[PDB]
Amino acid sequence: EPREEAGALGPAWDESQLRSYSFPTRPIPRLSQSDPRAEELIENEEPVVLTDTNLVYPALKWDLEYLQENIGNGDFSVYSASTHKFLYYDEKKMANFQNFKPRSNREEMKFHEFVEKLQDIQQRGGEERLYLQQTLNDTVGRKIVMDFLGFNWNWINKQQGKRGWGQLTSNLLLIGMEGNVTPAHYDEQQNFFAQIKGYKRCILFPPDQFECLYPYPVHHPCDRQSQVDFDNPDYERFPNFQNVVGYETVVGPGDVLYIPMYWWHHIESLLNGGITITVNFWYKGAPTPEYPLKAHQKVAIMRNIEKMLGEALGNPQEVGPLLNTMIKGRYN
Amino acid sequence: EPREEAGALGPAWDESQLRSYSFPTRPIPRLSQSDPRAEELIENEEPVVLTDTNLVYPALKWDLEYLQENIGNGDFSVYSASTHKFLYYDEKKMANFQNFKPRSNREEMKFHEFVEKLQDIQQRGGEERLYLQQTLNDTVGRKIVMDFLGFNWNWINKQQGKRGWGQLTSNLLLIGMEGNVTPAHYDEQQNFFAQIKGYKRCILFPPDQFECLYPYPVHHPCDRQSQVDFDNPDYERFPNFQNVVGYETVVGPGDVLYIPMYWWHHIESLLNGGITITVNFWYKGAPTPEYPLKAHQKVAIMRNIEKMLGEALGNPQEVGPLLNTMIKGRYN
Numbered sequence A, B: 001e002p003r004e005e006a007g008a009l010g011p012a013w014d015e016s017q018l019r020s021y022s023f024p025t026r027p028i029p030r031l032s033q034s035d036p037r038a039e040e041l042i043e044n045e046e047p048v049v050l051t052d053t054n055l056v057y058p059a060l061k062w063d064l065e066y067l068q069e070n071i072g073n074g075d076f077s078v079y080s081a082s083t084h085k086f087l088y089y090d091e092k093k094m095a096n097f098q099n100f101k102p103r104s105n106r107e108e109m110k111f112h113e114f115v116e117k118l119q120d121i122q123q124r125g126g127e128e129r130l131y132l133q134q135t136l137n138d139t140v141g142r143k144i145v146m147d148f149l150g151f152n153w154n155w156i157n158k159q160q161g162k163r164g165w166g167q168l169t170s171n172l173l174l175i176g177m178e179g180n181v182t183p184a185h186y187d188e189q190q191n192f193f194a195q196i197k198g199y200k201r202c203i204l205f206p207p208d209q210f211e212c213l214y215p216y217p218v219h220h221p222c223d224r225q226s227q228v229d230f231d232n233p234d235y236e237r238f239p240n241f242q243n244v245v246g247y248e249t250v251v252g253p254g255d256v257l258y259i260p261m262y263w264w265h266h267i268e269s270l271l272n273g274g275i276t277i278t279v280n281f282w283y284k285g286a287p288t289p290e291y292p293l294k295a296h297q298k299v300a301i302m303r304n305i306e307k308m309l310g311e312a313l314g315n316p317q318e319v320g321p322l323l324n325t326m327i328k329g330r331y332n
Ligand SMILES: Oc1c(I)cc(Cl)c2cccnc12
Pocket: A133, A172, A174, A182, A187, A193, A259, A265, A267
């Protein structure tokens, strides 16, 4: 059931704001940071919404206005698509596949310019949507640095210690528009996903559902994304999508979602629900210490064979025919 | 056309002694050792029958009687099958596959005992056939050592030098019974196949016909053999067998066949043609020095991925499902 906001301000969100999908899902547990079960889920690399970290307390005041006034005149990466689906591609790998035009084009700008194109689009009721994805570096204004400084570093660094994780690799900041979807993909890093403004539906799939999810080829610029269009699944090409079962939740201002290493996540900003703000924190996982082997290690292996083959053969286009030659009438 | 033996002794063999097969084949060139074209085929790793090496001149006198009188009382590996097809299995790998009973059972013995079971079988018109495959070591009698000593070492060692090949790894000696088939398989070593007594039909396939030949899984005890039963090919399981094209020849006393590294060979002793004797010499190929990649190197690669996977997963039975997970809806 949708959560009731304090002081009776009404339901935070309602069902009609969520897209409809072919697969069932179960709920991710919402817990307190002090709960022993949350700690148990994290070490066990299972998802968990932590409702009371205060991780990004100072950022909760943030709207566009405030950020405009304070982030300063630096350069911000802005992605742009004529549709609700924001398929991230990888630029390095574009060389690997020629018959692939990007359907979502990046563009650098200043915050006011991003806010410009934002207010405009809404004022002219357009279908174009936008995402601001910017790895928070240095150019940022004094107040925002003060906001940053006030994040709950005690809590997060102590999680990094207990999990024996490696180093904080990045802090993306995300500002998007209502209805924005980030299609299913997995990451190699442990992730804390800190919600700030707006509501996001997060659907997660364990790594053992590799077979139902059909990642793009490793050398493909969409490496790590599902090939399956969730809005129109192709059961002829992707029969095992019919078997997919997700874990689902809705995060709002103050919630931190642990997205474990190698879990798929598909993320959507609520329809008619306004802009969204998230900040995420990524940590390199603990290093390798044993059988039975875990699903994610098997995924590591498939990736590695694929990388190796592309090297040995001098050509990523040849990986697929070599793999078929290897299994046809032999392993299949 | 079948070759005419000197002094008009009649056709060496006739068509009716050859089994009938679903695939076409072309002839391997019969050449002289002095011919520049033979040297050109060898360095190019293509097959060639050399008609005048004198490689095993002293052994041409050998029949059963002579060998009995001279090889001495040592131990000789003898394979035994209730059929014409001698499927060699690998003993180490038997652990890897349980639902596999060997259909051709080995047995050690003395030469007279082998000759015993030979004369008997013929006298009692039986379907059981036998092969003597013995890596010539030391136990052998003085005359046979003298025979050995007289082989054309000048010629063979000078081939090893020119080809930059590594070391002579083995000298099998083969004595079999008429109609014996050795089903298609490939070897990793360069091979000189020296015919001595009887006639053998050798059908060879280049390594680029991997796809039509369907080798068993690398961890299978029949690793390196075709899965295809040439006498009853299963075009449902092995569709690309329909595309197979071989190079064929008939070798007799005095002929040496170069079987290049990684070429498939399927070998059959002529029907109604009596016992056969061969001695083969195997050399480790030249070491690796470049694209485009050669078929055999690609075969090296498929083998390696397969070996790696079996290691990483701690279980050869899991190689196949991991490979399918890796290609299904991804590369196929
Ligand atoms: O890597 C990510 C980006 I970039 C943007 C979003 Cl919305 C994500 C959401 C969940 C997990 N990872 C995400």
